[PDB]
């Protein structure tokens, strides 16, 4: 191949009747065929057989298929969102979660020990409540991941804002990193403090002009309390009446006043705000990685159960007998997907019926056209035997 990159184990799920025979190799059993014949003998075939549950009716069988198709999508949507997040943060491999161990066992091996797993799910529950149950668990786990990720972005916004106050640039920068009683006045009846943000060139001009700029200004009040890289920050002490006159006269000169006035409760509340933002984001990040791996293993088990159930159910509907159906899951080596899909189609397709058989073989992963991509849902083409292609 070269129309798609694979570097992680790919899976095709098939279910076939246990009386079947391949016509691509007549004189073979289906099980023997998978191991020996299929893609140059390099196919790894894994067990995936599950037994009978309790089926409502034939009538009920129809309702179950429809739901299974829908829940399978929905879980698939969720598991993709969890993986996209873990990948996005780059604090956990981006190069795994396609063949990253579930229950600390390699993924093709995990499927090999997958025979219908128990977490809360038993073979003596009804099929309708297993379809429902599973979906409820998957939706809860994802909604949790979405909320904590939502919270983590609101926390990033707060940490940037707070930081800017702590040292940024004077157009919103509020002071609390300078706390001196020699640069600010407090407990004062006549005096107040106005901070003036001044361009670096203009610093000399400010130093000369300020006392005479407004009337009634404390002289030798100019001190550089803070400095950024574009602006210089000065403290000026003056009369409360005269603050209006300074802000206005200063703007004409091309100085930018920063309205700040010294009070203890503001200074303390700016430092706390910065502190709580940092603490909130850091807690959220660890919680976000821990939660996403734990949620991921549970949803993986949930998803494969719907795929196992579904393929069995769809077999039961289309073929009827035999009551137990031969399900295998085949782990395909990278870039041998195209060859795999074709050999199974040729061999088993005849069982589904000649009407069912369409040629549109091939695969386009680029958005140039939307033909050449099998799914029973579309009227454009159909799978010719119960086959799902699973791409992690």
């Amino acid at each position: 191949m070269a129309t798609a990159l694979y570097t992680a184990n790919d899976f095709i799920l098939i279910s076939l009747p246990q009386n079947a025979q391949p016509v691509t190799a007549p004189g073979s059993k289906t099980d023997s065929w998978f191991n020996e014949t299929l893609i140059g003998g390099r196919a790894f075939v894994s067990d995936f057989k599950i037994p009978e549950f309790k089926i409502g009716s034939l009538d009920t069988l129809i309702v179950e298929s429809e739901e299974l198709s829908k829940v399978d999508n929905q879980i698939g949507a969720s598991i993709g969102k969890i993986i996209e997040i873990l990948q996005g943060l780059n604090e956990t491999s981006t190069n795994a979660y396609r063949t990253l161990p579930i229950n600390n066992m390699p993924v093709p091996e995990y499927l090999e020990n997958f025979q219908w797993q128990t977490r809360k799910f038993k073979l003596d529950k009804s099929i309708k409540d297993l379809i429902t149950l599973i979906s409820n668990e998957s939706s809860q786990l994802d909604a949790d991941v979405r909320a904590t990720y939502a919270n983590y972005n609101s926390a990033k916004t707060n940490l940037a804002a707070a930081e800017r106050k702590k040292t940024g640039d004077l157009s919103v920068r509020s002071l609390h990193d300078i706390v001196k009683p020699e640069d600010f006045v407090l407990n004062s009846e006549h005096l107040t403090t106005v901070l003036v943000a001044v361009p670096k060139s203009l610093k000399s001009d400010f130093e000369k002009s300020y006392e005479t700029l407004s009337k009634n200004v404390v002289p030798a009040s100019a001190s550089v309390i803070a400095e950024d890289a574009e602006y210089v920050l000065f403290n000026v002490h003056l009369f409360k009446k005269n603050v209006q006159e300074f802000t206005t006269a200063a703007r004409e000169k091309k100085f930018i006043p920063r309205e700040f006035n010294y009070s203890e409760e503001l200074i303390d509340q700016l430092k706390k705000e910065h502190d709580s933002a940092a603490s909130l984001e850091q807690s959220l990040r660890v919680q976000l990685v821990r939660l996403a791996k734990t949620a991921y293993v549970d949803v993986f088990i949930n998803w494969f159960h719907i795929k196992a159930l579904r393929v069995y159910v769809e077999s039961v509907l289309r073929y009827g007998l035999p009551p137990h159906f031969n399900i295998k899951i085949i782990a395909v080596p990278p870039k041998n997907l195209s060859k795999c899909k074709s050999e199974l189609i040729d061999a088993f397709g005849f069982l589904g019926g000649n009407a069912f058989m369409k040629d549109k073989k091939g695969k386009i992963n680029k958005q140039d056209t939307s033909l050449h991509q099998y799914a029973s849902l579309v009227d454009t083409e159909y799978e010719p035997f119960v086959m799902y292609i699973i791409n992690l």
Binding site: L58, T60, S65, L317, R318, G352, G353, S376, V378
Partner: protein, 40 residues
């Protein structure tokens, strides 16, 4: 006729034997054979 064939083939995954015979606006007949229940 073709869009009804495609919609019934996408609804019932396979599971049908669809014919058509032209009635001789132009019209057409159809036989479906919905093999089963719960979608009838």
């Amino acid at each position: 006729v073709d869009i009804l064939n495609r919609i019934l083939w996408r609804l019932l995954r396979g599971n049908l034997i669809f014919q058509n015979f032209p009635i001789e606006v132009e019209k057409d007949c159809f036989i479906i054979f919905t093999h089963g229940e719960t979608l009838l």
